[PDB]
Structure formats: structure tokens, C-alpha cells
């Protein structure tokens, strides 16, 4: 599993740091760019949030579709290919993907929506089935499917004569496998620590950045009109001074995590987009790159703001 | 002439039902484009333009000639 | 190879009106130059505001102003001026981590695809891979990826193995394939068939096991060398 991207905020500076007032709205017109400097770092993040998405999933010029008579020569994939009975159709699999996991403040929605996202899976996944490898390098060639895994296999040294003569005993060893998943899964919450975690940490600085509005940085309070209304102009300057400073401040020690966490997802983002070239859509030669093991193929299934592949 | 969106309130465009490939994203799968009395439309975009591979357990497209391309990095 | 002269050839001409005729090309060097000046920019204007202190030039408060004054004034420009510093420093530290994850991916890509032949799928740029040609550019690589992308299909049926005697066979080398009466091993990436004999196939035990086997005369090398 990887996360791909985070959720993408927003928060207009000058409405969070002052809350409706024109006074002091009027303080932080001098301290400068700063409000009109953040906005355009908070959007450098949303803008590339809906570039890595576009790079992970969609490396595929068309839809494919799959065909609507299954035979694969025993492997079982209704649990992997999509679901007309759902309203958007997530694959069995795709779904307890979806369930098991958990002031001028925006969110945007992403670009691609998680249902699109379901149609890009279901293309992968369904090109890479009756297309072989093939449909990256070009336009699909459909081909058997038990006449790649023979392919999949010189890949991995192992000769072809070692399927055709196996194949039914593979199948099990496969149609059985996909089940384990589905508990495994199912058991265990700590399946999707990874993708559980991202989403936390995001909603942990929100709450963090939200509880500062409440905090006197000196001043002698926190709700930013009770000095304006109580205390005046030459006054609440310097009390109004402090808050300012402080909400702007902690806005950086906002901003700079953002940029700094974004900047991690960015690397898991390539990460994928490197598997999904090279793992799915290839048989990747790298050692215990794509799991450990020699590896066969690898299909991809969405999950919120993140990836999970089956190896 | 005012279109309800995921994303919010877009005022200005002419919604059309057919589906394109994306040219302003917006929000939501929803894809502005300039295409003809040329006047600004939104859409919902395709992702991709459909299409389907017919597969048969026994057969088989083996590319009879190529190509050589040249992209740009 | 004389059409793949061509095709090459082209090729290298379109890629120049591919840029001639287009800036937007270059959109992400374009942009890396852009966002250092865009800070810079942001960072000099950032002398002109005042951050509440009474004035934008030091020396006019400088002059002006008794020290009691101007201390507590020029603290203001101070402590304005050097968080903008610390502002700007980040960036460049965030944006300078950006370009060396950038750089740590030209020089594989310059190492792999170049000095060698890369095997990664889509590492190379879409289709397999041949080789590639690198031009500097400002501050940034040009790479040429010439790639192999295959072209007019030809829908065949194919069958995994063949009994030929109740042996199977199996090809070595890429697929079984027929057009409807002789069956061609032939290799994967391009049409290119051949009658089957010994050397294209590599016995595995009987019959029944494989699925979907198909009989024909697998032919033999030796065989007709034994007319004397
Ligand atoms: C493929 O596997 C699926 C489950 O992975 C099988 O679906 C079950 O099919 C039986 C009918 O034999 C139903 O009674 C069950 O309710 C199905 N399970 C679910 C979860 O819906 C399916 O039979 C298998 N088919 C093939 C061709 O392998
Ligand atoms: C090869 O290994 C697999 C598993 O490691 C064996 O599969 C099982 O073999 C037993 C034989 O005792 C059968 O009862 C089971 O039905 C097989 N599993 C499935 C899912 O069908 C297989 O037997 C091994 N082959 C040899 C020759 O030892
Ligand atoms: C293989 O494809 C190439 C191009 O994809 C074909 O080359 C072209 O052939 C046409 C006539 O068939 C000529 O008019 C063009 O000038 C050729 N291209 C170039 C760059 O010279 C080639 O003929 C194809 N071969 C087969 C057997 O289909
Ligand atoms: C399948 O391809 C084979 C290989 O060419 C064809 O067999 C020969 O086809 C050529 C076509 O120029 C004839 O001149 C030969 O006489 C054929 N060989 C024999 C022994 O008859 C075959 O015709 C093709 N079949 C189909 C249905 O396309
Ligand atoms: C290939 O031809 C063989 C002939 O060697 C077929 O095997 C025969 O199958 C029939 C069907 O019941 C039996 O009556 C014969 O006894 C089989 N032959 C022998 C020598 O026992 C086989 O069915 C054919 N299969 C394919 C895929 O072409
Ligand atoms: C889309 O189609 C529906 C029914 O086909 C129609 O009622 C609606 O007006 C169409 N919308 C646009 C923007 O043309
Ligand atoms: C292969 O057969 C399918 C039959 O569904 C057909 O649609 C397709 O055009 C064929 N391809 C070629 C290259 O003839
Ligand atoms: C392929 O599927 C067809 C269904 O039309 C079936 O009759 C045939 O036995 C299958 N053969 C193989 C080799 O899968």
C-alpha cells in the first residue's frame, strides 16, 4: 500500500490570521507579501496533489473494458473486477478499502473523483488481463491469459512447460490465495496503517492549527474583536501587534509542514507511479521491488488517497 | 445560464452532456473547454475515450510492423 | 534498416518543429527559472514594506529619529526583514531538495537509459526502449528517448502447446500462432513466422495435461537430411 495524495486544502491567510475586521485587516497590509505569498505556497501543493493522482493512475491512453465472458483458465477475478451492483462499481476488494479505513479553512475535492478513479483501476486491471504487458507500449494485443502467465514465468527463469503442466494445481494456489486477502483485510486494521496514518496526520495539524486561534501569544485574548471592541486603536495596536504575529506564525509552522509532508507524499507518489510503470504494466526484475519473492504480475485497486497492490 | 456544480457555483458556461477529454480542470471531473459563437462550455470529461479489446481464449494480434518514435524528456 | 533510417530520421525533424514552433515544450524548466525569480521578486519588494515601523528606509530612520526611537523602530525592520529571509531560505531549501530529487533522477536516467539500454517499463518514455540522446538545455537535460512502439496488428489463433506425437511441445521462443491452416511459432513482438521444427520447441511430457493443445506435424530438421 501507498498513499498517493493528501487531502488537498486551502485556507485563505487573511481571513484566518484576521477574522472579519477592518481594522485589522489593515495591520496586515503592511507586514507585507506574506498572506499573498502563502496562498500561492497552499496552492503549489493542491495544484500537484491533482498531478500526482494524474500520474499514478492514469498512464493509459483509453479505457479498456473487460469482456463480459470470464474465462481466464481458472483464475477467478470477479473479486478484483468491478461490480455493476454497486452504484459506482468498486470491486468487491476495492470496497472494504473504502470501509476500513477512518476560519477560511477549505478542502477542495480532487480533480479525478473516486469514482473515476474505479474506472482507471478497472482499465489497468482490465487491460492488463486480456492484454498482456503489451497496452504499454502501444495499443492492446489481446492475447490468451494462460498464454502469458507463461510468459510471466521465462521472466522469472521458470519454463514455460512448468504452467501448461501445473496450470489447475496454479489456479487453486491462486483463486485460493485472492481469498486470504479478502480476512486479512478484513482482520486486520493495521493492513492499511499506512494510508490510515497520512490522513491523521493531516486532520492532526488542522485541530492543532484550529486550537491556535485560541491562544493570547501575550496578548489578552483570543477572540480578535473583544480587543478591537473593548480597546482602542492606539491601543490594541500592540495587542493586536502579538496576535497577528502569532496566527501569522503559527500559519508558517502550518505552511512548512505542508510543504515538507507534501513533499514525502510527492516521493511515495513516484514510488507508485514507478510500480504501476513498471510493476503492473511490465514484470519488474527487481529484486523484492515488488514484492518479495520472484514476481509474476501485479494488480492495482484504489483505495482513499492511496494505492494497494497485489503482488 | 448558470451551472451547479460538486465544486461550487459556475456561472458563465454553458454545460454540455457530451464528454471530451480535459482541458481546464475545474473540480470533480468537471472540465472547462472553449470549443464552439465560440463560447466558454463545462463538461464532464472522459477519462480516457473508451474503448474495449475483444478477448478470446485462443487468440491472438501479433504486430505485423512498427514504428519508431521520438519523445522528448 | 533503410525504412529505420527513415523513420529515424523523421522523427529527429519533427522533434524540432515539435519545438520551434513551441515554447510550451519547455514548461518545466520553464517554470523552475520562474519560481526562483518569483521569489526573489517577492523577496526584494519585501524591503520596501514597512512592517508597522514608521518608515521603509533604514536612514530615514535612521537620521529622523533619537535611538530611543529608532531602536524600537528599526527592531520592527529587523525583525520583519530577517523572518522574510527565513521565509525565503525554506524555499529555496524545499525547492532545492525538489530539484536534487530531480537531478538524482536524470543522472539514472543518464546512466540507465543512456549508457546502457534500459529494461524498466515507461522509465524511457512509452514503448520499449532503444536508446537516447542527451542535450543540455538551461539549467536542465533534454532527453531524446528513441523508442520502439509497434504498429499494424494482425489477429491469429494460438494454441499453448502442440502434441505431436502425445509429446507436447512447446514453443522456445515466443508464441504458437496459425491464420487458419498452418501453425508458425513465431517471436512475440513481431510478426514473423516460421515453419515448426525441432530447434523452435522444447519437448514436456505427454499430452493430456496441457489445455487447449492442438495437434500438427511438428516438422523435423534431421528427417530429410536421411534421403541417401
Ligand atoms: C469466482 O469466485 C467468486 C468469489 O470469489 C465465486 O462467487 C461465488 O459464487 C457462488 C456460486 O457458485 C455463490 O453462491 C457465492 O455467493 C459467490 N460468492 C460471492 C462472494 O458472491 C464464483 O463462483 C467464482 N466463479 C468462478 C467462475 O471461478
Ligand atoms: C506442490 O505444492 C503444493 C502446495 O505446496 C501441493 O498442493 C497440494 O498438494 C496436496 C497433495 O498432498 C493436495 O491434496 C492439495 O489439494 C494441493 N493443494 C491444492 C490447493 O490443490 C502440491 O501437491 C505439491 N506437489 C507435489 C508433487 O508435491
Ligand atoms: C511498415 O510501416 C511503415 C511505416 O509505418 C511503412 O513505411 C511506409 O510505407 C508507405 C507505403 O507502404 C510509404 O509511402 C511510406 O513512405 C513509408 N514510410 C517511410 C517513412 O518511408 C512500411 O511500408 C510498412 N511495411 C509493411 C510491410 O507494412
Ligand atoms: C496462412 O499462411 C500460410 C503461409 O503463407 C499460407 O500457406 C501458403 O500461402 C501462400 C500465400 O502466398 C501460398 O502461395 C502457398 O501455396 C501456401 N502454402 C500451401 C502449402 O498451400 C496459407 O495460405 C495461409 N492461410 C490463410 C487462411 O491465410
Ligand atoms: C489430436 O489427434 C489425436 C490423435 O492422435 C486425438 O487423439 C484421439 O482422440 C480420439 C477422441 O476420442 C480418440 O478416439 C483416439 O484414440 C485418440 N488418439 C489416440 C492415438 O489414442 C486428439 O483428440 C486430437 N486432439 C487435438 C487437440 O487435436
Ligand atoms: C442532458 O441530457 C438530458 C436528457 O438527455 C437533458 O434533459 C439535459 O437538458 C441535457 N443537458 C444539457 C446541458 O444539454
Ligand atoms: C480481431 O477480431 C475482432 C473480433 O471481435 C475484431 O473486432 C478486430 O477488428 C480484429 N482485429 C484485426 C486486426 O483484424
Ligand atoms: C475457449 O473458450 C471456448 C468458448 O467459446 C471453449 O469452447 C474452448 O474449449 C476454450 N478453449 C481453450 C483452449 O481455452
Not at chain 1, 270 to 295: I, P, W
Not at chain 2, 5 to 14: D, H, M, V
Not at chain 2, 22 to 34: E, H, M, T, V
Not at chain 3, 54 to 60: E, G, K, P
Request: aromatic residues 8%.
Amino acid at each position: 500500500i501507498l498513499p498517493v495524495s493528501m487531502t488537498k486544502t486551502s485556507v485563505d491567510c487573511t481571513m484566518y490570521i484576521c477574522g472579519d475586521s477592518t481594522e485589522c485587516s489593515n495591520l496586515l497590509l503592511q507586514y507585507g507579501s506574506f498572506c499573498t505569498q502563502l496562498n500561492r505556497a497552499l496552492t503549489g501543493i493542491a495544484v500537484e496533489q491533482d498531478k500526482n493522482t494524474q500520474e499514478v493512475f492514469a498512464q493509459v491512453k483509453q479505457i479498456y473494458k473487460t469482456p463480459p465472458i470470464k474465462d481466464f483458465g481458472g483464475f477467478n477475478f470477479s473479486q478484483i473486477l468491478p461490480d455493476p451492483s454497486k452504484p459506482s462499481k468498486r470491486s468487491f476488494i476495492e470496497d472494504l478499502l473504502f470501509n476500513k479505513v477512518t476560519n477560511g479553512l477549505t478542502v477542495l475535492p480532487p480533480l479525478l473523483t473516486d469514482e473515476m478513479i474505479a474506472q482507471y483501476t478497472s482499465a489497468l486491471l482490465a487491460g492488463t488481463i486480456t492484454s498482456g504487458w503489451t497496452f504499454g507500449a502501444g495499443a492492446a494485443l489481446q492475447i490468451p491469459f494462460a498464454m502469458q502467465m507463461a510468459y510471466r514465468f521465462n521472466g522469472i527463469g521458470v519454463t514455460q512447460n512448468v504452467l501448461y503442466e501445473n496450470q489447475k494445481l496454479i489456479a487453486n494456489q491462486f483463486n485460493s490465495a485472492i481469498g486470504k486477502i479478502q480476512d486479512s483485510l478484513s482482520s486486520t486494521a493495521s493492513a492499511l496503517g499506512k494510508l490510515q496514518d497520512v490522513v491523521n496526520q493531516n486532520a492532526q495539524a488542522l485541530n492543532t492549527l484550529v486550537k491556535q486561534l485560541s491562544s493570547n501569544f501575550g496578548a489578552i485574548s483570543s477572540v480578535l474583536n473583544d480587543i478591537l471592541s473593548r480597546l482602542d486603536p492606539p491601543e490594541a495596536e500592540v495587542q493586536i501587534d502579538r496576535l497577528i504575529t502569532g496566527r501569522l506564525q503559527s500559519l508558517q509552522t502550518y505552511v512548512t509542514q505542508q510543504l515538507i509532508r507534501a513533499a514525502e507524499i510527492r516521493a511515495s507518489a513516484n514510488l507508485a507511479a514507478t510500480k504501476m510503470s513498471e510493476c503492473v504494466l511490465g514484470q519488474s526484475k527487481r529484486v523484492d521491488f515488488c514484492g518479495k519473492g520472484y514476481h509474476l504480475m501485479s494488480f492495482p485497486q484504489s483505495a482513499p488517497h492511496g494505492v494497494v497492490f497485489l503482488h | 445560464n448558470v451551472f451547479q456544480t460538486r465544486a461550487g457555483c459556475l456561472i458563465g458556461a454553458e454545460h454540455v452532456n457530451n464528454s471530451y477529454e480535459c482541458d481546464i480542470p475545474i473540480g470533480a471531473g468537471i472540465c472547462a473547454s472553449y470549443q464552439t459563437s465560440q463560447s466558454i462550455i463545462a463538461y464532464t470529461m472522459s477519462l480516457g475515450a473508451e474503448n474495449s479489446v475483444a478477448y478470446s481464449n485462443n487468440s491472438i494480434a501479433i504486430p505485423t510492423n512498427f514504428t519508431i518514435s521520438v519523445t522528448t524528456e | 534498416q533503410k525504412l529505420i533510417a527513415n523513420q529515424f530520421n523523421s522523427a529527429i525533424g519533427k522533434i524540432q518543429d515539435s519545438l520551434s514552433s513551441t515554447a510550451s515544450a519547455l514548461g518545466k524548466l520553464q517554470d523552475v527559472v520562474n519560481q526562483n525569480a518569483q521569489a526573489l521578486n517577492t523577496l526584494v519588494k519585501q524591503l520596501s514594506s514597512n512592517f508597522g515601523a514608521i518608515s521603509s528606509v533604514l536612514n530615514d530612520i535612521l537620521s529622523r529619529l533619537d535611538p530611543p526611537e529608532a531602536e524600537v523602530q528599526i527592531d520592527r525592520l529587523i525583525t520583519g526583514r530577517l523572518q522574510s529571509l527565513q521565509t525565503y531560505v525554506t524555499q529555496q531549501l524545499i525547492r532545492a531538495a525538489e530539484i536534487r530529487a530531480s537531478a538524482n533522477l536524470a543522472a539514472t536516467k543518464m546512466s540507465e537509459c543512456v549508457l546502457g539500454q534500459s529494461k524498466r517499463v515507461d522509465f524511457c518514455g512509452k514503448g520499449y526502449h532503444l536508446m537516447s540522446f542527451p542535450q543540455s538545455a538551461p539549467h536542465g537535460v533534454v532527453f531524446l528517448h528513441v523508442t520502439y512502439v509497434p504498429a499494424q496488428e494482425k489477429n491469429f489463433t494460438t494454441a499453448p502447446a502442440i502434441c505431436h506425437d502425445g509429446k507436447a511441445h512447446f514453443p522456445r521462443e515466443g508464441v504458437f500462432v496459425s491464420n487458419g491452416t498452418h501453425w508458425f511459432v513465431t517471436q512475440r513482438n513481431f510478426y514473423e513466422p516460421q515453419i515448426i521444427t525441432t530447434d523452435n520447441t522444447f519437448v514436456s511430457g505427454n499430452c493430456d495435461v496441457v489445455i487447449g493443445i492442438v495437434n500438427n506435424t511438428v516438422y523435423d530438421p534431421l528427417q530429410p537430411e536421411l534421403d541417401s
